[PDB]
Amino acid sequence: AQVISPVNGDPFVGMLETPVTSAPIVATYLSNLPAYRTGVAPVLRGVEIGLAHGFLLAGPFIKLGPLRNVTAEIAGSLSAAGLVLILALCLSIYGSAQFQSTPSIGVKTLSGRSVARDPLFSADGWSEFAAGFLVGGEAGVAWAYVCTQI
């Protein structure tokens, strides 16, 4: 039996469903992540994504910086709080252009029935994400220097 097969039956769609892409697992983990969830309101997703990057940006600006050889973690603290606020400009300005009239997603599931469209892509959508990326980011940054410093 072939490990690799056409995309959900269709062999004339630009993709190949490998055991990397489609499998018993991976289809369960990626849905567990904040962004891919369909039924939840647009507030709580942005916080769960936004917070996370506040810790991925936090470690960095401590040990490699100019004041690495000394204010080393105060130095690294608000600099992680920054790429947060710029992303918020990037994501608020990303939103400012795109959405003028109604959403646009692959409406159905793998099962193929017409499920309700997500608020991930809408006028009131990316706003609460852009807010989630801020309140998550700014607060989420503070806890990489209440634990490593204070």
């Binding site: 400009l89 300005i93 400012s96 252009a97 795109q98």
Partner: peptide, 29 residues
């Protein structure tokens, strides 16, 4: 150190920051 502490980082960031922002919105919309 009074003037150039203010005007250098505003011309360095805050002028291009809102320029790249308000010119992006002029392009796409």
């Amino acid at each position: 150190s009074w003037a150039p502490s203010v005007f250098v980082p505003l011309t360095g960031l805050v002028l291009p920051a809102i320029a790249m922002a308000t010119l992006f919105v002029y392009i796409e919309k």
